[PDB]
UniProtKB/Swiss-Prot annotation:
The gene is PABPC1. This is Polyadenylate-binding protein 1. Ubiquitous. It is found in: Cytoplasm; Cytoplasm, Stress granule; Nucleus; Cell projection, Lamellipodium. Residues 49-144 are annotated as: (Microbial infection) Binding to HRSV M2-1 protein. Binds the poly(A) tail of mRNA, including that of its own transcript, and regulates processes of mRNA metabolism such as pre-mRNA splicing and mRNA stability. Its function in translational initiation regulation can either be enhanced by PAIP1 or repressed by PAIP2. Can probably bind to cytoplasmic RNA sequences other than poly(A) in vivo. Binds to N6-methyladenosine (m6A)-containing mRNAs and contributes to MYC stability by binding to m6A-containing MYC mRNAs. Involved in translationally coupled mRNA turnover. The RNA-binding domains RRM1 and RRM2 and the C-terminus (last 138 amino acids) regions interact with the PABPC1-interacting motif-1 (PAM1) and -2 (PAM2) of PAIP1, respectively. May form homodimers. Component of a multisubunit autoregulatory ribonucleoprotein complex (ARC), at least composed of IGF2BP1, PABPC1 and CSDE1. Directly interacts with IGF2BP1; the interaction is enhanced by SEPIN14P20 peptide RBPR. Part of a complex associated with the FOS mCRD domain and consisting of HNRPD, SYNCRIP, PAIP1 and CSDE1/UNR. Interacts with the PABPC1-interacting motif-1 (PAM1) and -2 (PAM2) of PAIP1 and PAIP2. Interacts with PAIP1 with a 1:1 stoichiometry and with PAIP2 with a 1:2 stoichiometry. The interaction with CSDE1 is direct and RNA-independent. Phosphorylated by MAPKAPK2. The modification Omega-N-methylarginine is found at R14, R26. Residues 50-127 form the PABC domain. The modification N6-acetyllysine is found at K20. Many viruses shutoff host mRNA translational machinery by inhibiting cellular PABPC1 activity using different mechanisms. Picornaviruses, caliciviruses or lentiviruses encode proteases that cleave PABPC1 at several defined sites in the proline-rich linker region between RRMs and the C-terminal domain. Rotaviruses, gammherpesviruses and bunyamwera virus relocalize PABPC1 from the cytoplasm to the nucleus thus altering its function. Many of these viruses translate their mRNA in a PABPC1-independent manner and are unaffected by host PABPC1 inhibition. The lineage of its organism: Eukaryota, Metazoa, Chordata, Craniata, Vertebrata.
Length: 144
């Protein structure tokens, strides 16, 4: 790496790291009939809306909301990823394990994978046994 941010030691700064570790534990059958272009496994969902919120968006406001839109502007965006399951997801992303707060700002996919994952954590902390008694740690008058 050029600067002292990450650590991977790879001159291949063109492609993204292989985050998909395909283990060869399964039985490698034939099914080698996939030569032409595959149009399946991908619905007809084009991009009609605008650019969503993520790490890229965060880096778009270095001297502005570099540490804000990550969990204070993503709210209207999460509702898209999850059935209006937001309201706390991204807001949590500014207080989660902290590692998700870092990865989300460093990857245009982390903010999404860590958000969706934080959802599993939000639901487990919502109406579950993770009910908090402290009501003074909450917000008072919502700003705009």
């Amino acid at each position: 790496g050029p600067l002292g941010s990450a650590a991977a030691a790879t001159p291949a700064v063109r492609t993204v790291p292989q985050y998909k570790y395909a283990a060869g534990v399964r039985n490698p059958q034939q099914h080698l009939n996939a030569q032409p272009q595959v149009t399946m496994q991908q619905p007809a969902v084009h991009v009609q809306g605008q650019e969503p919120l993520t790490a890229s968006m965060l880096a778009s406001a270095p001297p502005q909301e570099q540490k804000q839109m990550l969990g204070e502007r993503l709210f209207p965006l999460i509702q898209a990823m999850h059935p209006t399951l937001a309201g706390k997801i991204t807001g949590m992303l500014l207080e989660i394990d902290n590692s998700e707060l870092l990865h989300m700002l460093e990857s245009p996919e982390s903010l999404r994978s860590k958000v969706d994952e934080a959802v599993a954590v939000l639901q487990a902390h919502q109406a579950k046994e993770a009910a908090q008694k402290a009501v003074n740690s909450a917000t008072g008058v919502p700003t705009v």
